[PDB]
Structure formats: C-alpha cells, structure tokens
Amino acid sequence: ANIAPRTVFFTIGSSELSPREEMNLSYLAAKMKEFPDTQYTVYGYADSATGTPAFNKELSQKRAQAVVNALVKKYGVDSSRLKVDAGGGVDKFGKPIYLNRVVLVESVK
Amino acid sequence: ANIAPRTVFFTIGSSELSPREEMNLSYLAAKMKEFPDTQYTVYGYADSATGTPAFNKELSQKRAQAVVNALVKKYGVDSSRLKVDAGGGVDKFGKPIYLNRVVLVESVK
C-alpha cells in the first residue's frame, strides 16, 4: 500500500514549485489524506555537475522543504508524517543533468 | 492499494514523452510490476483553448497511447492491464492552459 515514488522536478538553481508540480502534488496529498497513518521521506536532490557541493546541499534541502510545505500548508498533511532528506548534488539520475534536479517522495515501510 | 493518479505532461501539440516523464513513468511501472493484478485507465487530454476539437481528440488519444506504449514496451507491463481513454480537448485542469496537456494514469477499482 506504499506509493509509487513521486517525482517533482525543478528548474536550474531553483526550489520553486511550478504549476505542473502543484498539480502533480495535489493528487499525492489526496492519497496521503485517505490513509492518514502512512509516513513518507521527502528526498531532495540537485545535480552535482553544476554548482558547489554546499550550494547543492542547501538547494536539495530547500527543494525537499518546499514539497513538504505545499503538502502541509496547501493540502493539509500533518507535518509529523513527512521527513526531509537532503541528498545534495548527485548524478544518481543520469543525463540530461536536469533529471537530478528533483524531489523523490517515498513511503516509509 | 490504488495509486495516486499519475500526471504526465506534454509540450504544445506533442505526444512525445520527455526525459523527465520517462523517469516519472519508470517508478509507476515498478509499482505496476509489484502488483501484477491491478488494472489502470490511461486518460489522455489536451487543452480545448487551442486547436480544433478533432485535433485535440486525436492528440489526447496519442498521448494516452504513448504512455501505454512506454509501460508495455520499455517497462514490461501487460498491455491488457491498461485501457486508453481519449478525453479530447478540455479545460478541466484550469490555467495555465498547458495543465490540460496531460495524461492521468488511474487505478481501476
């Protein structure tokens, strides 16, 4: 009953949620509200191919936090159910490098 | 145990899947493979604010079909589990109008 990991993409150097991602996120929040006991990890990432490690660490943190903030503030999800994990700059998502500018929302087993 | 509806967005007049959407879709396919009995409807849409009704109908069909084709051909999902619904041109997704250029993958209850 654990979600398919949710992908939220971002533009370069930005932690802002686009209209597409707000739409994406509203469906996930409805599922979260339907099963109020489920826990989630909100992994934030950035591409290590540009910017410094510390900038990419902060950016990944802010990306995860913006996803948390929309679920909590806009779609009414208990903040205690969401845990931020700042993954920093990575290449774990391959190329094009913007695929690493992403948040993954995953269920906690 | 039904998925949170999955959003797959498209560029104007196009039914091509971007690198971001292929990444998005790979996580959904893994969930589909984990629970092989689940059925899904693949709703395709276009924005009714541009183009003719018949063009938007075909475009919505091709969008849904491209999502089906990636799940079946690239991520090995039984074609019989996925049903296309061509929604044609709509405004059901609000503005900006590109939010209507989308596929929704939904579980069949």
A6-107: what fold?
60s Ribosomal Protein L30; Chain: A; (3.30.1330)
Domain boundaries defined on chain A: 6-107
Nearest to B23 among A23, A30, A99 (CB): A99
- Rounded Cα distance, B71 and B82, in Å: 9
Find the residue in B nearest to A96 (Cα). Answer: B19
Q: How far is CA B97 from the centre of its chain?
A: 17
A40 near A108, Cβ under 8 Å?
yes
Look up tokens 């075909």; give the residue: B58
Terminal Cα distance for chain A, rounded: 10
Q: Is A35 on the interface with B (CB under 8 A)?
A: no
Nearest to B27 among A7, A24, A31 (CB): A7
Find all residues with CB under 8 Å of A34, minimum gap 6, and list them. Answer: none
Number of other CB atoms surrounding residue B66 within 10 Å? 21
Q: Is B51 left (phi over 0), alpha (psi -120 to 50) or beta?
A: left
Two structure tokens written together for A96: 């094009």
Asked if A7 lies within 8 A of B20 by C-beta distance, the reply is: yes
Technique behind the model: X-ray
Find the residue in A nearest to B24 (Cα). Answer: A7
Asked if B7 lies within 8 A of A23 by C-beta distance, the reply is: yes
B6 near B102, Cβ under 8 Å?
no
Resolution value in angstroms: 1.9
